[PDB]
Design a protein around this ligand. Structure first.
Ligand SMILES: COc1ccccc1OCCNC(=O)c1cc(=O)[nH]c2ccccc12
Ligand SMILES: COc1ccccc1OCCNC(=O)c1cc(=O)[nH]c2ccccc12
Lengths: 304, 304
């Protein structure tokens, strides 16, 4: 029992982190096989960041201008190319620690673990979610760019995020490992306001199921609702609409607890309308939405 | 910016996890050098757990009864001994992945990362704190015993916890790596009730400093207090007494923000007396106490 914001073990990803320097800028890179991936803004000076023309800035760079260091040893760069907002630095050495891996582009609501790195060295690991406004609420300081987000399935690391920037509101934006930003964000120092950060309804319901599995049952009520009635309440509270796909995804948690999805929806509806009344659920005074139904099952079953 | 419940990167500890089986019981072991540490209750059957005589049960066990498997390969046990509540299984092979390490016994209020393992395989990593009642609020299922708690200082892993059991209230109890339980808990299936789970005051203040550093400043008031006045309020709210040692430890966070410790104490006093009023601090609707002043500085500075 117990329910924690759990990250995947980060060892497989630590073995991939390198330091990339271009000019005076140092950030992190991800070394898989003989390629080092990093944000293309590594080629920018602070002045460049306001309105960068990446194709033009890249012309002034050669292989020897990208300094890649894995541990305390230097990697030889034999090629460089830009794919969307990431640079792919071809090195002459395959990473001996390359795990089985995939590059995936996640959808909002999906969670992942971040290995926050500085100077190619991992400093910490924490669990994130891709917000419905395509930002992540991370913990990143200067030098953290190139830190990655990932999920692990037994021995296969699915990289889904690469850190690029912090918006003026303190939230974070980045790309998948193909260099495409999540959301409408661009790698430029300009006014980029995030949209409504709505609550991930299916995740809140999954976490309510986790609470019931872990003995926290006070919020369970004698009511039920329909998808349409619940969604009227969800819209009012800036919650994402719940679909039949979400109900189907919650099927196994419903079976494990014996609580029909729509009954749990009615419990959530009363929690939204009445509030917590000073009470807590799984040690939280607010409704947690950064656990997917898959994370609740994985944590409550012990998948390694 | 951003503030997350961050765990240490777990790679150094993943390289130490092994599976230990004795009879029909399988749990986790920690392999450092040529020694595998694991909870001594690995020798118990379910019946034994109610009133075990560990010295007597151990007499019936020989080296070949302890099956140690690191990955998919078997380790040869050439010695076994009981140190308090842990067994030390001497193996013929030094762990090639043994990091620089220390065994430390932490005090309540101190935080650490747990690498939850099952069958010697890591499933997740999360941040914990040793509660003032000597329990931890972990996330552990059947098979998790022998999972460890640790802190990392650059390249030295300081192991501080080894998981042994779940109390009937869903909280967790375990030992340091010398086999001594934290608190009054014993490795026996009997009535063991935990004491008052008070709030770690110095940690709440550290997290309030982290909130100010990260732009969440609404709770800052125009008041100050004294250590004695604050402690009267802290006692009323089941908060740990704040000492001058805690004030000294908060010195650097006070210097960074320009907010005197006693002024932050007065802000915390008003938060206790008035509540949050539906507001949040660093995305939480309650006062977080599982970040030490050292964790706030480390996260807010980027220590790798
Ligand atoms: C406005 O900056 C950019 C815009 C577009 C693209 C890139 C931009 O920055 C690149 C460098 N950024 C960081 O190193 C950085 C990342 C972060 O998440 N938090 C910080 C907190 C304090 C200081 C710096 C950071
Ligand atoms: C009452 O048990 C013990 C008492 C003293 C000593 C050892 C005891 O157990 C040893 C085995 N325990 C586990 O594998 C276990 C640990 C845990 O934290 N959560 C669980 C959740 C469900 C089922 C089992 C567990």
């Amino acid at each position: 029992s117990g329910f924690r914001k759990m990250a995947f073990p980060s060892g497989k990803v630590e073995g991939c982190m390198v330091q990339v320097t271009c000019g005076t800028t140092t950030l992190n890179g991800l070394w898989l096989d003989d390629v080092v991936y990093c944000p293309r803004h590594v080629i920018c000076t602070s002045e460049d960041m306001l309105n960068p023309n990446y194709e033009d800035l890249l012309i002034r760079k050669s292989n020897h201008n990208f300094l890649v260091q894995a541990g305390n040893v230097q990697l030889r760069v034999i090629g460089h190319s830009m794919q969307n907002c990431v640079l792919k630095l071809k090195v002459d050495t395959a990473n001996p620690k390359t795990p089985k891996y995939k590059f995936v582009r996640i959808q909002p609501g999906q969670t992942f673990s971040v290995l926050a790195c500085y100077n190619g060295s991992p400093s910490g690991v924490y669990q994130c979610a891709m917000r419905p406004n395509f930002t992540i609420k991370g913990s990143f300081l200067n030098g953290s760019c190139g830190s990655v987000g990932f999920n692990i399935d037994y021995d296969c690391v699915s990289f889904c995020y690469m850190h690029h920037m912090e918006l003026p509101t303190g939230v974070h934006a980045g790309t998948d490992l193909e260099g495409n930003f999540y959301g409408p964000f661009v790698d430029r120092q300009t006014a980029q306001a995030a949209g409504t950060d709505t609550t991930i309804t299916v995740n809140v319901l999954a976490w309510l199921y986790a609470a019931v599995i872990n003995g926290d049952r006070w919020f369970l009520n004698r009511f039920t609702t329909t998808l349409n009635d619940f969604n009227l309440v969800a819209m009012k509270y800036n919650y994402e609409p719940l679909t039949q796909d979400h109900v189907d995804i919650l099927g196994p948690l419903s079976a494990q607890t014996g609580i029909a999805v729509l009954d749990m929806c009615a419990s959530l509806k009363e929690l939204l309308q009445n509030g917590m009344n000073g009470r807590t659920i799984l040690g939280s005074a607010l409704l947690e939405d950064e656990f997917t139904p898959f994370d609740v099952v994985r944590q409550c079953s012990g998948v390694t």
